[PDB]
Write a protein that holds these residues in place. Structure first.
Motif, PDB file in Angstrom:
ATOM      1  N   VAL B  34       0.833  -1.198   0.000  1.00 55.44           N
ATOM      2  CA  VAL B  34       0.000   0.000   0.000  1.00 55.44           C
ATOM      3  C   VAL B  34       0.869   1.251   0.000  1.00 55.44           C
ATOM      4  N   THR B  38       1.136   3.838  -3.304  1.00 55.43           N
ATOM      5  CA  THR B  38       0.773   5.232  -3.083  1.00 55.43           C
ATOM      6  C   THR B  38       1.934   6.146  -3.481  1.00 55.43           C
ATOM      7  N   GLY B 280      -4.686   2.421  -3.831  1.00 59.14           N
ATOM      8  CA  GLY B 280      -4.176   1.912  -2.572  1.00 59.14           C
ATOM      9  C   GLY B 280      -5.006   0.763  -2.030  1.00 59.14           C
TER      10      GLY B 280
END
Ligand SMILES: *Cc1c(COP(=O)(O)O)cnc(C)c1O
Ligand SMILES: *Cc1c(COP(=O)(O)O)cnc(C)c1O
Lengths: 400, 399
Positions: B34, B38, B280
């Motif tokens: 994640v 991002t 995400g």
């Protein structure tokens, strides 16, 4: 003194090399490292009350978060940070004003003046609440210079007028209407003004006190910041007058199966877990941006757009929709399919777009179904202009 | 695929600094996937040109376009058009109440809401009730602190239109008999709003098997970004729903005489999407797909049990935990909750106290608030040992 240095501004953006010639900042802006890093930190650290080795970093994040409203206030010269409300973006901000301020106040026959240059975000919500309340949307047309006709506004205002919906700056023409005059006219008739500042916040951030703006909305992703975050500014007394927006945690005070009470603004209008990453990232963007003279940065962007327009106007079948030497250059080339040009230009490393830009009424006013749009930001260069012009030349030769 | 707690745990960069983190029920730590996805999204142009990072740009685009499908796979949704993006569980529920319920509620109509509901799944119903002349009817708890699904038949009347029931409480961790509640509801022609903010993390609902009408959860609870959530709805219900917010994307044609909209899900998604959030969440789900959730949850639950068993041996201990949940809400007689939270933090243990946005539930339990330690698959046996010892130290200095 602070003198804008384009080269050093450029160096702050990691995406630049790969982006090539990026001319679509009006759709969404590239991010400075400060925003990337602030976001990385946020997702790499606990938000809990324990920090065994990164306490300083965690404390910085918290400071960014707790200072976020104030940094928005400083951008807008808002009287205090409690006049700042968080939203998903400009679109939610406007819907909130329509539903929480206007809807409980509009009566059958009341009028909502909306400019024909409005982005859909500042039109659809008004058509909706009009339908819901029996109010009527009244069109504010363009003048000969493609700006909402503020001279005509007094003639369009009647005793039934309650709301004015006007964009500070168009995402197509880049045109800015006489906002101060429009607001004076509106207030003369006891109206409230919803100002769409999704573009204006980036190029000419509005002094909401000087302009006596009632409501102001913009989006983070356009302002060198995170997606999924936006702002609604409102005069304190107007935010107080607004009904609650979404229902749930945070916004509520006490709850039973009989009913509920709410916090006061801004929290009243912010249900559920905030987009913390979005708030922190926007805070970082604003804090970063504060080291640059926006006036000088914007003049630089506008000067590039002018070089581009002047050169492109020497090519055949050119039409510009640009107003007031804007950083935004919307244009057309007769006898050329927009999608073909966009594609050819992309092959040449030029990133821009075509389409309707969520402004169908405006385009209809201009006699077109879409336009190409090259938008300039302070990380663009003169060589970018040359590259665009050169690519267009090749495109015109290849698309015969 | 065999689950290994250590392998799972090594994916969360925050842990070293986090110490003993036991507040996942409030918000979850993020895996590297994640964080990286991002970082990449914000480090690369979203434009149509990529001079040096074409490969990464393609991966981002792949994550984005596959996002709805990955949510669908999690819920066993019939197709990815039943997945709608929201800002969170809260918006998801408000959307249902405003876009489906509000246009269909006549005065006197009844909305059954469990007393265990998080505010998110109560306040919107109080709102729409006030707006329509409808009335919210309470579904109380049984002896096991669960919403009394067996009592539903005595509560359902010809006026009953909506049932708002949480798959899993954020306080007791209790899971009511959802299949049975739904059967009753559907017998009376009602629709059910299932609050899955916790459930999606621990026991993601099979929406087809359970015949769920609407299902909501948040990304930030599910090891993902903030500012992103999901509303699942049967395709018929999504089609029947009025538009949500007005603006770009959700429209088809627009003039000063009116407008038309896209079909679902885009009908319900005005303006620029939280692209970072979607990408995400996609990354979180894709990463999570590699792990057997049942084994991961079994681990979390087992830790909660070791913790509860131990704490139970201390004087004045009280637990509100249901069904051996990974959530452990508790209380110690004669201690200020805020004081224990503060000391535990000083000792390296991160948990919380308060009302947990569930005032009606707590009122029913006879308490003003509770402490809550929530266990996740990245917690360990030593976290339990540390929690116990820190509580012992705390109780000395307070009691
Ligand atoms: C981008 C834009 C909007 C909408 O912003 P969202 O973030 O999509 O809500 C509204 N008005 C103008 C002029 C814009 O440029
Ligand atoms: C956390 C939670 C919510 C709220 O989610 P948001 O992301 O804050 O909208 C709703 N219900 C339950 C059971 C929760 O745990």
């Amino acid at each position: 003194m602070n003198v804008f240095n384009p080269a050093q501004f450029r160096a702050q953006f990691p995406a630049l090399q790969d982006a090539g010639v990026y001319l679509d900042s009006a759709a969404t802006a590239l991010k400075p490292e400060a925003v990337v890093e602030a976001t990385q930190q946020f997702y790499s650290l606990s938000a809990g009350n324990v920090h065994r080795s990164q306490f300083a970093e965690a404390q910085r994040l918290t400071a960014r978060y707790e200072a976020a409203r104030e940094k928005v206030a400083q951008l807008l010269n808002a009287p205090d940070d409690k006049t700042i409300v968080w939203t998903r973006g400009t679109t939610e901000s406007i819907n909130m004003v329509a539903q929480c301020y206007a809807r409980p106040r509009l009566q059958p026959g009341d009028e909502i003046i909306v400019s024909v240059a409005e982005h859909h975000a500042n039109l659809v919500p008004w058509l909706m609440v009009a339908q819901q309340t029996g109010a009527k949307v009244v069109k504010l047309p363009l003048n000969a210079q493609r700006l909402p006709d503020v001279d005509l506004l007094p003639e369009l205002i009647t005793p039934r007028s309650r709301i004015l919906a006007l964009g500070q700056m168009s995402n197509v023409t880049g045109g800015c209407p006489d906002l101060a005059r429009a607001i004076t006219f509106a207030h003369s008739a006891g109206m409230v003004v919803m100002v769409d500042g999704a573009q204006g916040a980036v190029h000419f951030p509005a002094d909401v006190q000087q302009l006596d703006i009632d409501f102001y909305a913009f989006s983070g992703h356009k302002l060198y910041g995170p997606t999924g975050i936006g702002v609604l500014y409102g005069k304190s007394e107007l935010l107080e007058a607004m009904s609650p927006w979404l229902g749930g945690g945070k916004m509520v005070h006490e709850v039973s199966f009989d009913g509920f009470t709410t916090q006061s603004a801004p929290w009243k209008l912010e249900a559920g877990t905030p987009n913390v990453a979005g708030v922190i990232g926007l805070s970082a963007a604003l804090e970063w941006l504060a080291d640059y003279d926006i006036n000088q940065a914007e003049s630089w962007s506008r000067s590039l757009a002018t070089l581009a327009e002047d050169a492109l106007a020497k090519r055949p079948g050119f039409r510009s929709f640009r107003c007031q030497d804007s950083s935004l250059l919307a244009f057309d080339f007769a006898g050329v399919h927009h999608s073909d040009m966009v594609t050819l230009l992309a092959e040449y490393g030029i990133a821009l777009r075509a389409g309707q830009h969520c402004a169908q009424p405006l385009l209809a006013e201009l006699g077109v179904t879409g336009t190409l749009r090259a938008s300039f930001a302070p990380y663009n260069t003169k060589s970018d202009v040359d590259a665009l012009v050169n690519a267009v030349d090749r495109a015109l030769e290849l698309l015969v």
